[PDB]
Every structure is written in structure tokens, then in C-alpha cells.
Ligand binder design. Structure first.
Ligand SMILES: C[C@H]1CN(c2ncccc2F)CC(=O)N1
Length: 182
């Protein structure tokens, strides 16, 4: 509809795949080369399905901050024959608040879904399904099951991935430039 959805659409069309684990189907953001992110609660194993193709997992790392607290981001390297467009320059360097964000989802259940979630607060600490979690973004939209891995964008920035909600609000794990330095 507007320049927010334009940027979101550009990311979804080139930098997402449909990831299936034993814990379900997730929106999965490809960041560069064969490196993608997914909520840690997807429980990535040795094998993952990527757009319904059996794919070896070459590496997977559940991120924690230096207080040894969950970040709910799993960085995955895929045995895929094709690289992602490099979008690391759209990642923020710092923890921040944002205006006018879009949450974008693409699964078998929710294809081509874009939600204007509005203002995004640096919420910080969240007890997420009973796990102390840091660097959480919050938006006042009543998000539902099927949206985990959803990409949260502003114009010009990919800021996080959807990891949960409480019926009234949704929560995203921050993405930071420092997570994907090579
Ligand atoms: C497909 C399903 C999802 N849905 C949602 N309702 C409320 C919050 C978040 C939602 F995704 C709208 C709808 O028509 N049904």
C-alpha cells in the first residue's frame, strides 16, 4: 500500500524461505551466503526442510548475550546450492525503538501476509514461554500462532524476527549487524 510495505515486500520476495522442523513451519530470513535465522524454539536439528526440500544443516548456533541469557535467535548455515542476497547493510548496529513497523509472514498457512504493527518499543527483558530472554522488541498488535520467524522491518531496516505474543502484544528478537560479522 505504502513505502513501509514496499520495503517489507522486497525482503520477503528475495530473502525468505519456508522452514519446517519437527516443531512446525516457520518464516525464515536469509541474511547472506547460506546463512539464515529462525526462532530458537523451532529446535533446528541436523536436517531441515527448506521450501519442502530435505536440507542438511551445516551449523546452528542458539545466540545468548554475555550475561548468558537467551536471545531466541538461532543462526543456521544451510547446505543449499544457492546464496541469499546480502542484506546485512539493512541490519541496525544498536538496540533502538522504531516507528511504523511491518511484520511479514510467508508459510503454507499464511502466504503473502503483511501486518502494520505500528510503534516498536525496546522492551528488553521478557519471560518468553518461561525462559528469561533479552533484547525483545514489543508492538501492540494481537499476533497469533503461525507468525514466528515473521520479519519486522521499517523503511530501510530489518530490525527483528517475531518470537511470541500474549494475545494483546507481539514480541520480536532483535537482529543486530554484530550477529553476522564474518
Ligand atoms: C488468517 C487469520 C489471521 N488473522 C489474524 N487475526 C488477528 C490477529 C492476527 C491475525 F493474523 C486474520 C484472519 O482473517 N484470520
Amino acid at each position: 500500500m505504502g513505502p513501509g510495505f514496499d520495503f517489507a515486500q522486497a525482503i520477503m520476495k528475495k530473502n525468505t524461505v519456508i522452514a519446517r522442523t519437527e516443531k512446525g513451519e516457520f518464516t525464515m530470513l536469509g541474511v547472506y551466503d547460506r546463512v539464515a535465522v529462525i526462532p530458537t524454539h523451532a529446535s533446528v536439528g541436523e536436517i531441515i526442510y527448506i521450501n519442502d526440500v530435505e536440507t542438511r544443516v551445516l551449523d546452528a548456533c542458539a545466540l545468548r548475550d554475555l550475561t548468558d541469557t537467551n536471545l531466541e535467535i538461532t543462526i543456521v548455515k544451510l547446505d543449499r546450492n544457492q546464496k541469499f542476497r546480502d542484506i546485512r547493510h539493512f541490519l541496525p548496529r544498536c538496540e533502538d525503538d522504531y516507528n511504523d513497523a511491518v511484520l511479514s509472514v510467508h508459510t503454507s498457512k499464511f502466504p503473502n501476509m503483511y501486518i502494520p504493527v505500528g510503534q516498536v518499543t525496546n522492551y528488553g527483558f521478557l519471560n518468553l514461554g518461561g525462559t528469561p530472554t533479552h533484547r525483545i522488541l514489543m508492538y501492540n498488535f494481537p499476533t497469533r500462532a503461525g507468525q514466528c520467524g515473521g520479519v519486522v522491518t521499517t523503511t530501510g531496516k530489518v530490525i527483528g524476527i517475531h518470537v511470541g505474543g500474549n494475545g494483546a502484544q507481539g514480541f520480536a528478537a532483535m537482529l543486530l549487524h554484530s550477529y553476522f560479522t564474518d
